[PDB]
Amino acid sequence: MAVTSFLGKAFEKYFYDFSAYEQFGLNRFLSSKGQYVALRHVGFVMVGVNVLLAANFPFNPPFPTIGMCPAGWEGTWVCQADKAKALEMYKEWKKSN
Amino acid sequence: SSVRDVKTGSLPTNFLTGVYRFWRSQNPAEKPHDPVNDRLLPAVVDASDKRASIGTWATTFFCTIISCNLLGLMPFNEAPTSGLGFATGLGVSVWATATILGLSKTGFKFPFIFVPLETISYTFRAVSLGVRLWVNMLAGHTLLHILTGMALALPFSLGFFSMVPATFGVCCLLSALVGLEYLVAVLQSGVFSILSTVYVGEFNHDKFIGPAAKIVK
Amino acid sequence: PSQNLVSTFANKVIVEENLVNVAEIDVPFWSYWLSSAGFTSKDAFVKFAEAVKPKVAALSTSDITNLTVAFKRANYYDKDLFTGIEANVSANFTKFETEQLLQIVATFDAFNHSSVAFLDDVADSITYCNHYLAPVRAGADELATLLTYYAKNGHERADLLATVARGFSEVSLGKLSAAQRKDTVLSALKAFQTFGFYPESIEAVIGAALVSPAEYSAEELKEVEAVKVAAENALGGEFVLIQEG
Amino acid sequence: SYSAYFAKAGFQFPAGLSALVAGIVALNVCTGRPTKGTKEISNAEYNATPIGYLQSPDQHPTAFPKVPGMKDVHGSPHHHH
Amino acid sequence: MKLLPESLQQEAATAAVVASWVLWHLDTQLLPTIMREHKLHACWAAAAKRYNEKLFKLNPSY
Amino acid sequence: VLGEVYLKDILRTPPTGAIPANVPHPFQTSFYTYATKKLIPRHWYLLGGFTFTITLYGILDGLRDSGKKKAYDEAIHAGKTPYTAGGH
Amino acid sequence: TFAQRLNSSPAFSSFLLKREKAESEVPPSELELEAAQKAAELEDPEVALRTL
Amino acid sequence: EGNSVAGIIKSVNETSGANLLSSLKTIKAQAAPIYPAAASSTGYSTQAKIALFGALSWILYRADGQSKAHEWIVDLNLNVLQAAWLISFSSLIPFRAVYFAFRGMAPATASTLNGLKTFSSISL
Amino acid sequence: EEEELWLLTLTQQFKHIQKHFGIDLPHSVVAHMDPLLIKKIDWETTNALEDFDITLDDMGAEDAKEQWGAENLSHHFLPLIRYRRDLARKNGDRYGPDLVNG
Ligand SMILES: [Zn+2]
C-alpha cells in the first residue's frame, strides 16, 4: 500500500457508509438516530471504563470505594483503605501469587 | 522570505473575519456631528489613531483562551487556563492594559473618602477577570475527577459488564458534564473578552479634533 | 612601542579613503546612514555619486528614497545622477509610496530639478497608485513642499491637488511648531492660489493662520486674506472661525 | 480549476510556530532553579554518591501502580531520622 | 490539589508569550490575509455604482 | 492605440504561464516593520500590561520564597525537621 | 453554476465535506441554471460569432 | 508574461479572413488562465510528519505521566470521557451547514462580487 | 480598437475574480492581477486602519464609504488617463480633467 492513501480510504468508508445503526437493523429498537448516538456515546464510556479496569484488575483503588469490595477479597490488599497498609500486604501477596 | 499562498474564502479566513468583526463591533466609533467628507477625513483617521486596538486585543484573548480552554477537553490534555498563573495572568494583563491606556490619557499621573471605594471595586476587576476564568476551568475539571472516581467504584466492586443499569445512569451523568464543559470552555473565553472590551473601552475616549474654521452655506 | 604601533595603524588603515572603499558595495545604504550621522563631505559624496550610477536604473524604491534624502542632507547635486533617479521613479511610479515620493520631491524641490514626465508620474502615483489617505499620514510640511514644487514648475494637476488637500487639517498642522506651521501655511496658500484651486479643506490652512494672527505680518496676512476672499466665493460662502463648544 | 494548485502544498505549520515553541521551551528550561524534585549538591557529594542513592523514591512513581504510592526506586537507606 | 504553581512568574510569562504570539500572528499573518479578501469584496461593492457610472461616461462605444 | 505600456504594473490579466508567488505584506517581510509601525505604536498598552503581570508575579514569587525561608530557618533554629520527611 | 463551482472547490474534497453537495444548501435558481447552459453554448467562439 | 488580451488582439490581427474562424479555439486556449494540473502524491510532507510524530510523542508522554499520577485510573478514564465527545461531534455536527454558516460570517463570502456590470465596459 | 486593450483587460480580470473569488482563487493571483489594489489594502493594514470600512460604517458615512471604495479602484482608470493625456500632449493640447476649470 501507500501508507497515507490506503487506510484513509478505508477510514473514509468506515466513517461514512459503514453504519451499524442500519446494517445491524436496530431501527426496530431505537426511535431516532439522534438517540442511537446518545447511547453509543454512553456505551463507549461504559465499555471504556470496563476495559480500563479489567486490563489491570488486582489494584488497590486510588478512588474512594463506597464501602464495597470486588470479589472474594474483602480483607486483602485490594480492599484495604489504608495505603501504606496495603503496600505491605501486596508485597506479601506477590511472593505467593 | 517567500510567504505561503492562501485560498480566498477558506473556512479559517471566514471564521476569523467574523470573529474579528465581532470584537471590533463591541467598541464602535462615534458619529461626528459633521458630515464625513474630505474635510472630516483627517479627523476620522486621527480618531482611529487614538482609539485602542480593542478589536485586535479582544480577538487575541478570544483565540488564545478558547484554544486553551478547549485543550482541556482533548484527551491526554489539560487546559493551560486551569493553572493559576496562566489564567489570572491573563486577567491582570487585561486590567493593566486598561489602566495603562487610562493613565496615558493624561500624562501618566495616577488618579474625598469616596475614591478609595471606587479604586477597590476597580482593583478587584483585576483579580475577578482572571479568577473567573481559572475557577471555571478548575471547578469543572475537579468535579469530573470526583465523579469519575465514584463511577469507577461500581464496576470495580461489581461485575465488569454486569449490573449495568447502575453504571449507565452515572456514565450518562459523566457524559453530560463533559458536554457542559464544552459550553463553559466557549462561554468563558467569550466572557473574558467581552469584559476586556468593556474595561479597556472605558478609557477609549478622546476629543474629536474636527474643523476649527468653516465656510458656511 | 605600543603607542607607536597603534598610531601607525591609525594613519594608514582607518582613514576616510578606506571608509569609502568598503562603502562601494551597497551605496544607498551607506550613503543614507552616514549622512544621518552628520557626514556631509562633499567630495566623498562624489565617490558615491559615480559608484551608484550604473545601479540607479535597477534600485528598489526604498533605495531611491535613501539616495535622494542622503544627497539632500549632504546638499550635493549631481545632475546626471538625478536624471537617473527621476528615470527610476518615472519608470517604476506604481511602486513608490507617498511616504517615499514626498521625500524624493523635497530633494528635487531644493535642487531645482524637474521633468514634465517626472511631474506627471509623481502626481499619477500619489493620486492613483497610492492610498487616498496617505496624505493624511504625511505631515503638512512635506505636503506644502509638494504643493510649491508643482507651482514653481507651473504644473496644474487638479487631481493631485485634491489629494494633497486631504492632508491639511487641524490635526496635521497642529503637529507643527508655530514657526514651521507659519512657514507651511504661507507656502500652501501661495500654491493654492497659483492654480486657483480652493478645496473645502483650504479652510483649515486659512484657519491655521487666522486663529493665531499675531505671528504673521500685515503683508503676509494680506496674502492670507487675498486667498480667503478668493476661496470664499469659490466655495460659495463666508469664512467663520469656530470657538470650540 | 485551482483545486489542484492547493493540493500541491501539503501541511504547513503556522507561520511563526518555531518562535512559540522556542519561547515556551525557553521558559520551561531557563527556570533559574533546580529541576522540580531535585536539589543542587556539591561536586564532592555527587562524585561520592551512587546513582541509586542520588535518586529519591518520590521522583520515580510506579508506572501503573497496584497500590497508590508505589515507587520504583528506593534511594538512600541512610535516613537522618 | 494543585493550586499554586511552582513558579507564578513562569506561568504568567507563558501566558504573555502565548498571547503575544497570537497577537503577532494575527496582526502579521492572519489580518493581512483577512483584509486582502475582505476589502477586495468591500471596495468592489462600495465602488460598483460609481465605478460603472464613471466607466459609462468614459467609453465612447455607445 | 492603448498599447500595454499603459497597463504595465497597473492591470494584469489572469496568469497563463504559472501561478506567481504571493505578495508579502510588509509585516510578514520583517519583524522590524511590524514592531516599529504597529506593535509599539498600537499595542504597547498590551506589552505594558504583560510586563506588569510578569513583574507583579515575580513580587509574589519573591514573597512566597521569603516566607518559605522564614519558616525553614524557624525549624533548624528550633530543632525540628522542616518537612514531613517525604513519606518513603 | 455557483454551487457546481463550489462542489469542485478544495473545501468539498475535504474529509468532513466529501459526501456533501453544495446544491443541498441553496440550490441554483432557474436563471442560474439556464445561464450556465447558455454560457456552455458560447464557449465556442465561432458559435458566439454566428449568434451575434 | 504579458497580458493575454494583448495576446488575443495580436493573434487575431495576424490571422487571415479564411482561417479566422478556425483559429478562434486556439486563440481562446492560448489566453485561458493556467489551472495547474493535479500532480502525483508525494504524500505526508516533512512538516506533516513532524506534526504527527510530535503529536504521538506528546500523546505518549502525556499518557506516560497520567499513568503514574496517583489518580491514574481516574486520569486514564477521563481520556475515554473526553474522546467520547470527539466521536459524538463527528456524528452530530452538521458539517455542511457549519461550512455555509462560516461563509456567512465573512462579508466576502456572504454575497457575490458586485462591480463591473458589463454594459459599462463594452467595446463596440 | 483604440482603447480596447484597457476595456477588455478590465473585463477579463474582473470576470476571473468574480468566477473564482471565495471559491478557489489564490491570493497570489489576486495580487498578480490587481497589484495596486493589494498595495492600497496593505497600506491600511500597515497604517493601523484595517477596520476603516467598519469605522465608516460605525459613523454612518455612507458617502465616504463609496469614496473609499472608489479611490481604491481609482487606478483602474489610470491606463486610460495616461493614454488620453499622452494623446493631448502630442497634439499640443492639455488634458481636460487635469485642469481645475477645465
Ligand atoms: Zn485529567
Domain map (residue ranges) of chain B: 1-217
Q: Give the minimum alpha-carbon distance from H109 to chain I in angstroms, rounded to a whole number.
A: 6
User: Which experiment gave this structure?
Assistant: cryo-EM
| Distance from residue B78's CA to the centre of ligand 1 (Å) | 6
Three cell numbers written together for D74:
528506593
Three cell numbers written together for H88:
459524538
Q: How many domains does chain D have?
A: 1
Burial per residue of I66-95, b for 16 or more beta-carbon CB atoms within 10 angstroms, e otherwise: bbbbbbbbbbbbbbbbbbbbbeeeeeeeeb
Please indicate, yes or no, whether residues C143 and C84 belong to a single structural domain of this protein. no
Count of CB atoms situated within 10 Å of the CB of A15: 15
The minimal CB distance from E26 to the residues B59, B89, B90 is found for B59
Mind giving me the DSSP string for D7-68? TTS-----TTHHHHHHHHHHHHS--SS--SS-----HHHHHHS-HHHHS-STTSB-SS-SST
Q: How many residues does this entry show for chain D?
A: 81
Name the phi and psi angles at D71, rounded to 5: -120, 155
Torsion on CA atoms H51, H57, H58, H62, rounded to nearest 10: 160
Count of CB atoms situated within 10 Å of the CB of C130: 27
Count of CB atoms situated within 10 Å of the CB of E45: 20
Q: ∠ CA(B173), CA(B174), CA(B176), 5° rounding?
A: 65
| Distance from residue B76's CA to the centre of ligand 1 (Å) | 7
Count of CB atoms situated within 10 Å of the CB of D20: 18
SS (H, E, C) chain C: CHHHHHHHHHCCCCCHHHHCCCCCCCHHHHHHHHHHCCCCCCCCHHHHHHHCCCCHHHCCHHHHHHHHHHHHHCCCCCCCCHHHHHHHHCCCCCCCCHHHHHHHHHHHHHCCCCCHHHHHHHHHHHHCCCCCCCCCCCCHHHHHHHHHHHHHCCCCCHHHHHHHHHHCCHHHHHCCCHHHHHHHHHHHHHHHHHHCCCCHHHCCCCHHHHCCHHHCCHHHHHHHHHHHHHHHHHHCCEEEECCCC
Say which DSSP state I68 is in.
H
Among B1, B7, B13, B63, which would you mutate to test the D interface (most chain D Cβ atoms within 10 Å of its Cβ)?
B7
Three cell numbers written together for A81:
483503605
Please indicate, yes or no, whether residues C72 and C96 belong to a single structural domain of this protein. yes
* Residue of I35, I26, I33, I17 lying closest to I72 (CA atoms): I35
Cα dihedral sign, C211-C216-C222-C228: negative
E56 contacts in chain H (CB < 8 Å) = 119-120
Instruction: Say whether residue A16 is in contact with chain G using an 8 A CB cutoff.
Output: yes
Classify residue C5: in a domain, yes or no.
no
Q: Distance between CA atoms of B92 and F60, rounded to whole angstroms? A: 13
Q: Distance between CA atoms of E18 and A22, rounded to whole angstroms? A: 47
Cα dihedral sign, A24-A26-A28-A32: negative
Q: Is B63 exposed, middle or buried (0-12, 13-18, 19+ CB in 10 A)?
A: buried
Q: Is C146 exposed, middle or buried (0-12, 13-18, 19+ CB in 10 A)?
A: buried
Q: Distance between CA atoms of H28 and H8, rounded to whole angstroms? A: 8
Task: Give first-to-last CA distance, chain B, whole Å.
Answer: 55
Distances (CA, A) of B209 to C98, C181, C200, I7, I52: 24, 17, 17, 43, 18
For chain E, which chains pass the contact test of at least 3 CB pairs under 8 Å? B, D, F, H, I
Q: Distance between CA atoms of B14 and C129, rounded to whole angstroms? A: 29
Say which DSSP state F16 is in.
S
Q: Let me know: does C146 contact B22? Beta carbons within 8 Å.
A: no
Q: How many CB pairs under 8 A join B and G?
A: 3
The residues of B whose Cβ lies within 8 A of any Cβ of I are 5-9, 21, 24-25, 28-32, 35-37, 41, 44-45, 47-49, 53, 55
| Distance from residue B147's CA to the centre of ligand 1 (Å) | 12
Please indicate, yes or no, whether residues C90 and C164 belong to a single structural domain of this protein. no
Burial per residue of C151-176, b for 16 or more beta-carbon CB atoms within 10 angstroms, e otherwise: bebebbbbbbbbbbbbbbbbbbbeeb
Name the phi and psi angles at B38, rounded to 5: -70, -15
Q: Let me know: does B95 contact B106? Beta carbons within 8 Å.
A: no
Q: Which residues pair with D17 in a beta bridge?
A: none
Please indicate, yes or no, whether residues C224 and C171 belong to a single structural domain of this protein. yes
Please indicate, yes or no, whether residues C180 and C215 belong to a single structural domain of this protein. yes
Q: Give the minimum alpha-carbon distance from G49 to chain H in angstroms, rounded to a whole number.
A: 9
Count of CB atoms situated within 10 Å of the CB of B90: 31
Q: Distance between CA atoms of B68 and C243, rounded to whole angstroms? A: 53
* Pairing outcome for strands C238-241 and B213-216: antiparallel
Half-sphere exposure of E8 (CA within 13 A, CB side): 22
Q: How many domains does chain C have?
A: 2
Q: Distance between CA atoms of C237 and B42, rounded to whole angstroms? A: 22
> Is B141 annotated as ligand-binding?
yes
| Binding-face residues of D in 3-62 toward B, CB within 8 A | 5-6, 9, 12, 15
Instruction: Say whether residue I49 is in contact with chain B using an 8 A CB cutoff.
Output: yes
Instruction: Say whether residue H102 is in contact with chain G using an 8 A CB cutoff.
Output: no
Q: Distance between CA atoms of E17 and D24, rounded to whole angstroms? A: 7
Q: Let me know: does C191 contact C147? Beta carbons within 8 Å.
A: yes
DSSP SS3 for B36: coil
Please indicate, yes or no, whether residues C38 and C118 belong to a single structural domain of this protein. yes
Please indicate, yes or no, whether residues C106 and C199 belong to a single structural domain of this protein. no
Q: Which residues contact H102 (CB under 8 A, 6 or more apart)?
A: B11, B14, B15, B18
Classify residue C228: in a domain, yes or no.
yes
* Radius of gyration (C-alpha) of chain D in whole angstroms: 23
Please indicate, yes or no, whether residues C234 and C165 belong to a single structural domain of this protein. yes
Torsion on CA atoms B128, B129, B133, B136, rounded to nearest 10: 30
Grid-cell match 505604536, residue found: F41
* Residue of B101, H17, I23 lying closest to F52 (CA atoms): B101
Q: ∠ CA(H47), CA(H50), CA(H54), 5° rounding?
A: 150
| Boundary residue ending a domain (C83, C110, C135) | C135
Contact between F11 and I16 using a beta-carbon 8 Å cutoff: no
Q: Distance between CA atoms of E1 and E4, rounded to whole angstroms? A: 9
B17 contacts in chain H (CB < 8 Å) = 105-108
Classify residue C7: in a domain, yes or no.
no
Instruction: Say whether residue A4 is in contact with chain G using an 8 A CB cutoff.
Output: no
DSSP SS3 for A64: coil
Classify residue C205: in a domain, yes or no.
yes
Q: How many residues does this entry show for chain H?
A: 124
Q: Distance between CA atoms of F46 and B90, rounded to whole angstroms? A: 11
| Distance from residue B185's CA to the centre of ligand 1 (Å) | 15
Count of CB atoms situated within 10 Å of the CB of C192: 25
Torsion on CA atoms C93, C95, C99, C102, rounded to nearest 10: -10
Question: Could you tell me the residue range of the domain that residue D44 belongs to?
Answer: 1-81
Q: Let me know: does H81 contact B148? Beta carbons within 8 Å.
A: yes
Q: Distance between CA atoms of H123 and C88, rounded to whole angstroms? A: 34
Question: Could you tell me the residue range of the domain that residue C127 belongs to?
Answer: 26-135
Q: Let me know: does F27 contact I45? Beta carbons within 8 Å.
A: yes
| Distance from residue B151's CA to the centre of ligand 1 (Å) | 15
Please indicate, yes or no, whether residues C42 and C30 belong to a single structural domain of this protein. yes
Q: Let me know: does B213 contact C239? Beta carbons within 8 Å.
A: yes
> Is B145 annotated as ligand-binding?
yes
Classify residue C15: in a domain, yes or no.
no
Q: Distance between CA atoms of G7 and G11, rounded to whole angstroms? A: 8
Please indicate, yes or no, whether residues C124 and C152 belong to a single structural domain of this protein. no
Q: Let me know: does I43 contact C134? Beta carbons within 8 Å.
A: yes
Range H60-65, long-range pairs (CB < 8 A, 24+ positions): H62/B76, H62/B77, H63/B76, H64/D63
Contact between E9 and F58 using a beta-carbon 8 Å cutoff: yes
Among I3, I4, I5, I27, which would you mutate to test the F interface (most chain F Cβ atoms within 10 Å of its Cβ)?
I5
| Binding-face residues of D in 39-68 toward I, CB within 8 A | none
Three cell numbers written together for C230:
478668493
> Is B78 annotated as ligand-binding?
yes
Count of CB atoms situated within 10 Å of the CB of D57: 17
Classify residue C160: in a domain, yes or no.
yes
Q: Give the minimum alpha-carbon distance from D43 to chain H in angstroms, rounded to a whole number.
A: 31
Q: Which residues contact C125 (CB under 8 A, 6 or more apart)?
A: C93, C94, C96, C98, C101
Q: Distance between CA atoms of I37 and I43, rounded to whole angstroms? A: 10
Name the phi and psi angles at B213, rounded to 5: -145, 140
For residue H87, the chain A residue with the least C-alpha distance is A41
Please indicate, yes or no, whether residues C82 and C140 belong to a single structural domain of this protein. no
Task: Give first-to-last CA distance, chain C, whole Å.
Answer: 78
Please indicate, yes or no, whether residues C235 and C167 belong to a single structural domain of this protein. yes
B7 contacts in chain G (CB < 8 Å) = 10
